[PDB]
């Protein structure tokens, strides 16, 4: 908005702007370092305890 | 008299129904003074206060 001037310094125009905001786009990644000689238990079938 | 020009000056405003506004009061002395800034008015204007 803007207050109507009562003056006639200059015509009191209406008032829009168009912002554009630009995001942040971020990314984010660790290691889980897993050791094979678990998997190979992993893909095994137990049996004894 | 002044009892009976009371509602000559009176054009409405003592018949007018009551409605409370958010106001901050303060006392000086034995009156309440309604304290107010209509500053936001202006800055969403960007007019000078």
Known sequence: PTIAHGDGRRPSKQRTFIVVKNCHKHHISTEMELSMLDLEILHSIPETP | ?????????????????????????????????????????????QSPY
Request: proline fraction near 7%.
């Open chain 2, 1 to 45: 008299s002044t009892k009976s020009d009371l509602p000559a000056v009176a054009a409405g405003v003592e018949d007018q129904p009551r409605v409370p506004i958010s106001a901050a009061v303060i006392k000086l002395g034995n009156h309440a003074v309604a304290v107010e800034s209509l500053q936001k008015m202006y800055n969403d204007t």
